[PDB]
Every structure is written in structure tokens, then in C-alpha cells.
Design a protein around this motif. Sequence first.
Motif, PDB file in Angstrom:
ATOM      1  N   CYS A  29      -5.580  -2.326   2.885  1.00 32.06           N
ATOM      2  CA  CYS A  29      -6.065  -0.962   2.731  1.00 32.06           C
ATOM      3  C   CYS A  29      -7.514  -0.966   2.236  1.00 32.06           C
ATOM      4  O   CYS A  29      -8.173  -2.007   2.070  1.00 32.06           O
ATOM      5  CB  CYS A  29      -5.119  -0.195   1.803  1.00 32.06           C
ATOM      6  N   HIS A  63      -4.744  -2.989  -1.094  1.00 29.65           N
ATOM      7  CA  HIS A  63      -3.306  -3.139  -0.944  1.00 29.65           C
ATOM      8  C   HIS A  63      -2.960  -3.784   0.400  1.00 29.65           C
ATOM      9  O   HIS A  63      -3.731  -3.740   1.362  1.00 29.65           O
ATOM     10  CB  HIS A  63      -2.601  -1.786  -1.027  1.00 29.65           C
ATOM     11  N   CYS A  75       0.823  -1.202   0.000  1.00 23.44           N
ATOM     12  CA  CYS A  75       0.000   0.000   0.000  1.00 23.44           C
ATOM     13  C   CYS A  75       0.861   1.257   0.000  1.00 23.44           C
ATOM     14  O   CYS A  75       1.877   1.341   0.698  1.00 23.44           O
ATOM     15  CB  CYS A  75      -0.931  -0.010   1.211  1.00 23.44           C
ATOM     16  N   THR A  76       0.455   2.232  -0.814  1.00 18.57           N
ATOM     17  CA  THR A  76       1.135   3.520  -0.900  1.00 18.57           C
ATOM     18  C   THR A  76       0.216   4.677  -0.529  1.00 18.57           C
ATOM     19  O   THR A  76       0.621   5.842  -0.647  1.00 18.57           O
ATOM     20  CB  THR A  76       1.702   3.738  -2.308  1.00 18.57           C
ATOM     21  N   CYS A  77      -1.000   4.386  -0.060  1.00 15.77           N
ATOM     22  CA  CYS A  77      -1.984   5.436   0.158  1.00 15.77           C
ATOM     23  C   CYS A  77      -1.763   6.181   1.467  1.00 15.77           C
ATOM     24  O   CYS A  77      -2.129   7.357   1.574  1.00 15.77           O
ATOM     25  CB  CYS A  77      -3.397   4.847   0.151  1.00 15.77           C
TER      26      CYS A  77
END
Length: 201
Positions: free
Chosen positions: A165, A169, A117-119
Motif C-alpha cells: 500500500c 502495508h 492493509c486495511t486502507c
Amino acid sequence: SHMASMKKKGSVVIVGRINLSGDTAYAQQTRGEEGCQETSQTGRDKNQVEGEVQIVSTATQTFLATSINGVLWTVYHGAGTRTIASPKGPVTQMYTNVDKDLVGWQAPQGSRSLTPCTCGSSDLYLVTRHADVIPVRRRGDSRGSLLSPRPISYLKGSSGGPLLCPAGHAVGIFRTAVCTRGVAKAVEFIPVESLETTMRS
Ligand SMILES: [Zn+2]
């Protein structure tokens, strides 16, 4: 004559998977007790693998493993240094880190991986070994609170499963629950960033 008699720990064995393919999450068993024991001794597992979350067993434990960026991850306190059974025989761990309670093998062919996850979100979802999807509010780099506390039995054997997420993710790997009164109010997990660092070190 103990040297000639000294046993060898079996391999970790995939015995099922958590299906997240469609709109309903459920646990599927792929191997029963006898087959699991035989496969652990030989380390030879010809079964087709599918999905992102595997259910894995030792002789003494059952828990989860999660594929993320081509690596099948799980907890050291469940798998130890054990090999995992595979079609070609026992596969040696690719990563072993007792300090993070993390181990990993190359993702078996047929598995699908989750993306890190990149959020930066804090609204999370923990997948248990019974295919329950528990909402979890992130409270720190490696801790999250259950929106609805539950008895510890509800989470037994979910170590190595994922926290996800909103967009699906992978945010972390479930490590251990935080219990007061034998009730689980929170969870500790291994953040995916920690896995990403391991994968490039
Ligand atoms: Zn995300």
C-alpha cells in the motif's frame, strides 16, 4: 533396487533478502551457490535472518518469500510442498494451497512481518527480486496494471514478493505476470485477505 536409490527433494533455502529498512531498496545476497546446495540437502541453515522479503532458491528456481503476520509466504508453483531450511533443520509448511498458488511457513526468527492493509487503496507498489519498486494500479480483487510496461525478464523470479500500500502495508503476494508480446502490462497477485482467511481456517 529403485527404492533404495530414490532421492529426496531439497529444502527451500534463503539466499538473500530485499532490504526495505531505510530509504533505498536493494537486494542483498546472503549465500552463494555451493552453500545454497549444501543447505538445501541438509535443511540446516544457521544464518541470521532479517527483513520482510526473502530471496529463496530451490535446485531449479529462485524467487521470493514474504513475511506477513508471522508467516513466511510464497507461491506453490515455486516451492511446491518443500520444507524450508532453518537453524533447527527442515521446517514443514504451515499452509499449502495449490488452488491459491500459496504456501507458508512459520516466519523464521529474526524476520520482520508486514501488516495486512486495511486502507482499501488502489495505488500499489510491487517489489521485485532486484529491489525495483514498480508502481501498480489495482484493477480488481487480484489484478493490477503496471504503470510502465516492461519485458517479462524484468519480473522473472519475483513470484512470492509483495505488493504494498502507500502506507507500507501488504496488499498481496505477486503470483504471475500477464504478458502480451512478451511484454508485461499487468500482474496477478494473491490478495492479503486471502492469506488472512488461510491463517484462520
Ligand atoms: Zn494500507
